[PDB]
Amino acid sequence: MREVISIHVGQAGVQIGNACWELYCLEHGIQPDGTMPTQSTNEGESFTTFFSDTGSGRYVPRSIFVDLEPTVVDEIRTGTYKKLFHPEQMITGKEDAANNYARGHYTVGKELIDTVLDRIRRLADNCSGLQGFFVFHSFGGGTGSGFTSLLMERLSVDYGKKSKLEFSIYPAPQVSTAVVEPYNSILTTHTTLEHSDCAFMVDNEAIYDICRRNLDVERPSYTNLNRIISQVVSSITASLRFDGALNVDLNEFQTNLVPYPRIHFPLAAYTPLISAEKAYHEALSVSDITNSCFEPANQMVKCDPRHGKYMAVCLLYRGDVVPKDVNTAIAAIKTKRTIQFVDWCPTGFKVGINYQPPTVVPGGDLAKVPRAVCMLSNTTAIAEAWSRLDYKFDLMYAKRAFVHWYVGEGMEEGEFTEAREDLAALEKDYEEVG
Amino acid sequence: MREVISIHVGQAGVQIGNACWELYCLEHGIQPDGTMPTQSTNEGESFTTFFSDTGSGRYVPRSIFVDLEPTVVDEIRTGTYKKLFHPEQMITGKEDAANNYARGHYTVGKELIDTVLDRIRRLADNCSGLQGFFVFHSFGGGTGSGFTSLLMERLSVDYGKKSKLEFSIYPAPQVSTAVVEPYNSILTTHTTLEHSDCAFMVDNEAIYDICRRNLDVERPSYTNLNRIISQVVSSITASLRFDGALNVDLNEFQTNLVPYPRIHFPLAAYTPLISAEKAYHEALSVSDITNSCFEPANQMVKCDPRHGKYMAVCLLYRGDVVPKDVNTAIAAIKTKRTIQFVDWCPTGFKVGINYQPPTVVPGGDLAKVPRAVCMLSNTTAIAEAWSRLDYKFDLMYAKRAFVHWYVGEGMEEGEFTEAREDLAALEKDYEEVG
Amino acid sequence: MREIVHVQAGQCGNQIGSKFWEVISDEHGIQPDGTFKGETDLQLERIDVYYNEANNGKYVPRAVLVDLEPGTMDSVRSGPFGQLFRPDNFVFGQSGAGNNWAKGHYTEGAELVDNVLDVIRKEAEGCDCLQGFQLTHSLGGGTGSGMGTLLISKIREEYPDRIMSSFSVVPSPKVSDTVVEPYNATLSVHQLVENTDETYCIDNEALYDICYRTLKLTNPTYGDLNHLVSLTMSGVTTCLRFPGQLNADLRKLAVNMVPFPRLHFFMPGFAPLSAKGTQAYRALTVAELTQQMFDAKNMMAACDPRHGRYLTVAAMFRGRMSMREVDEQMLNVQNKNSSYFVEWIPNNVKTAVCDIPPRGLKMAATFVGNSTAIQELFKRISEQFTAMFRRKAFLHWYTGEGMDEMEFTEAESNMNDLISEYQQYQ
């Protein structure tokens, strides 16, 4: 049937995948050792998109772990989730690229790219309904940028027509770690425009704002930030892993949300995202959280949504939701005038309601709420998020700082110049279409 | 249906609200933890004006607690009534204004006014029958005067036509605490004439006179004074919370009792207000307590009602009262001639009789009496209560004492002069209409 | 056939009918389910006039229930005979008039008038030929005196032909009930003298004086005061619902009485009226029931009958009676009380006798009179109306709604011409 493959490249690929595949074992009733208990067969209704069958219910994830460094991969090969994954699906590196492009685009990647594309083809030949790709990466990583652009340069030659999905983290304009992240974000945007269907972005700080105010988590780290992103990942798959009245597959997401083949970069949002106590004193209706979707304390990228112009807003609901107030509240959004559209698209809405409510992680900070919304809103606030990063790249480039690492690794300096004219017209097209 | 929101600003807003919402849990049968017992559903007949429903009978009060100081708010967050209220409805301050206008009108208020007006709008959008506002404040408070005038300056922009009600304490001409209370009472009268439908006043001493003589409470404090005021609050709501033969809503109160849009300041009275023993040796009829309404030992503001001229006297009865002797006793009041009217208003009477008698507080000092009257009497004795306070304000202003706190906090001294000409013609209009 | 709807608006008229439909239910032998349990078909052969039978005999009353709030809806709905009314008619708003005429007329009543206008249309489309409307509301309050005022101004656009019964309570000279009570009177009667055919000025004050002396009841329940309003209205329409030796419809009650197109302001009367223990000690003769009808005690309004003149005497007698003793004594009152009549109108007595008494008696009398002492009802209110206009009080509750000052004075001139017309023939 339909079967979807996931690829995890970089350390952000490692631990986000350590949460998403951890979460899916809860939502299908699969024990982490590798087999299933017999009670979760009725829950296991069309789980075939990720898990091959082996011998007696033993379910390997159709997932590939790619890293140039063996350290964080051994965390998978130490914990409980060691026996779940397949060993020859784990392909490790030895020498690190250290957030450098040609160290991750030519040096260690080209010794390992031929090993992993076989493991792509070894697994994908079982498919008769191969839909899409979950590729997880960063923007400033050596293998996060240098290998990811090269990997998407090769799978479009192989499979082409079949879809792709990229999840990543938007680098914050104020608080971020690596100094080469303004460099590599221009590099990972250069040749991945042509080789990616859609790519999503989240902020470190925009997670933190709801963590401190609504979750009331005043000591967050990369443990709980992986759980919050994984709920957004799981809510997309709920249209596919279960039987809904009006649901949507991966080819349909890009068909609605891509108005032009270059501007295809929306973001995410999730609500209700609060702690376990505040849901007790409040009855969260449909009109409650849907109006909570379109306020700037709910976006997952810290920018100005009111200074952006909405073009195609996508909505996926979960839980037992009636469509009457849905057909009212989205109309009640249209009664408000602050939600600005473009003049040519009034019909940029998507309706999706699944029967299954989201189930929370065990021992987590969330609360069991029936209603939830995964808001996807492509807008022109991405252009205002382009200018904050195009300011960082050029001024460090003008003094030619940190160029002496990019030179000797098999890389040219004129490629920095061509990406400048490439990204200049990109943020222009938000204002040209808008 | 109809739904009324309460706002509590200042420390007088805190503990009076700690009595009124405490009393309403008794009169509807709601346990203070947040849920209801199933026995009190038949008693719970049209209780929807204050209590949203949540999950399973869990009833949050449509109430907002506003304070610049976190101390007395923590008393709510320590006692039994912590789990009843909603946490994001509690918005606290940190730095105190200390009975100063521009410290409560500009300094700490303008950092918190944008947080609370959202919580107004978050709750009021559930309403289809939004009637009025219970705003509780003082006259000499920093947030009692400076924030209250600013708050009513903004809700009339938002909602306008919908009604409002203010409860407050008249500052006594002899016994009062803060020296700036002659200053701030002129300030809270300045711009709240335009932005308030009606505002009520009570005296500290006029409570004490019935407490010592009739209640025989020779150690009263702010515990039992909150219970006596709350019975006057509850008797107005008995026209709305229950089903009466001839009852009255909040739009109708201002329609009867406001003859001119500036003179709209009546006061209250309650009878029978005695201890638990003296009701045993006495059969309190209708003609007993109605004649007790119009004697100067029963008014809730210590002034001269015989030197005032009654203009519109409002009467709300509670308990099983027949209308025959009602139509006799008010006529029997008219047989007496000491009750003076104005020449143009003989028809300034209001008739209201509810079936439910007032129920007394548990462990309190009152007695279960079927008959009770909440007398409202707008009169020209308010003008004699203006001259006792206009004498205090001007003479301390002439020496310019205590001006050196008002200067540097973002405030002008000519605003003191404009309020003098504003309050001079106000007390003139009692004699002009009269 | 001859079909009449009954419409209630305002808190007064909503609870008057709530006891009044019960007697109409009980005089014809039906149930809160509408199940006919009358033993004789005399209670069925004119059941159609106030009912529309549908789907196995659950008779629904031809009634419209309008309020500006859902407060009075559930009390009638959960109260007695709540299952009998059709839930299609439960049309209401969410405002409440707050005792304001221009809210009930211009601001809030203008919204809800469109919904029940089709409901007035709907039950009138399913009949062959309508007969007239009966309306219960208030003149003191704000809802019925503001919204039911405007309703008569749109019935004449639909039906400029039939009659309009506008039953409403009126202010009393002793104790006013509301503060804007002279404002709710002059502005209402301004529209009542334009397009109405009868009003029954019932004082709230004198109804206690009926109960205090005849009934001797120490505890007047509001179910019991409207119960005396209930038996008054059922005796008026006894001809259309019951046979007899002389039948007289509402138009015959109209055409016999009103002499000029303004003077149709009538007070009702009812006999016998007494307490429990005085049953056997008095006489149930024509002579004893006669002189009760012409006492100041039986004056349901608080106006003095020997301070006016009876123009048209309507005697709606109920029960098996001797016609000649009715013919005897109606002569004998004019041989006694010739000063108490208008002089130039001969034979002031109109007699209609149905041979069926109401339930609870053996012989009853339903009186409606036209005293010219009802001129003093509009004398006392025209001073109280002009008591507060001279100081321009409460103008910000009307002009703030958008009321004209000339709207007062145009009504004020037509109020004072009204008492000149009683003065014309007195």
Ligand SMILES: Nc1nc2c(ncn2[C@@H]2O[C@H](COP(=O)(O)OP(=O)(O)OP(=O)(O)O)[C@@H](O)[C@H]2O)c(=O)[nH]1
């Ligand atoms: N929040 C979060 N961000 C991560 C995590 N792992 C990597 N990142 C992001 O990845 C960005 C840089 O990429 P890296 O993961 O450090 O390097 P890489 O992708 O493994 O590529 P190499 O340099 O070849 O090792 C940083 O800016 C981080 O924000 C993670 O576990 N949590």
Ligand SMILES: Nc1nc2c(ncn2[C@@H]2O[C@H](COP(=O)(O)OP(=O)(O)OP(=O)(O)O)[C@@H](O)[C@H]2O)c(=O)[nH]1
């Ligand atoms: N009876 C009674 N009066 C109170 C109570 N709390 C405050 N007041 C009155 O409030 C008046 C002054 O206002 P405060 O409450 O002291 O100050 P505030 O309203 O909190 O405003 P800030 O100065 O900004 O703190 C005093 O004159 C008191 O009479 C109370 O609990 N009981």
Ligand SMILES: Nc1nc2c(ncn2[C@@H]2O[C@H](COP(=O)(O)OP(=O)(O)O)[C@@H](O)[C@H]2O)c(=O)[nH]1
């Ligand atoms: N007998 C009786 N009269 C009533 C009752 N309720 C109201 N009234 C009369 O109705 C008049 C008030 O009009 P009302 O409809 O209540 O005011 P509105 O709602 O603003 O129109 C008063 O004169 C009352 O005497 C009742 O239950 N019984």
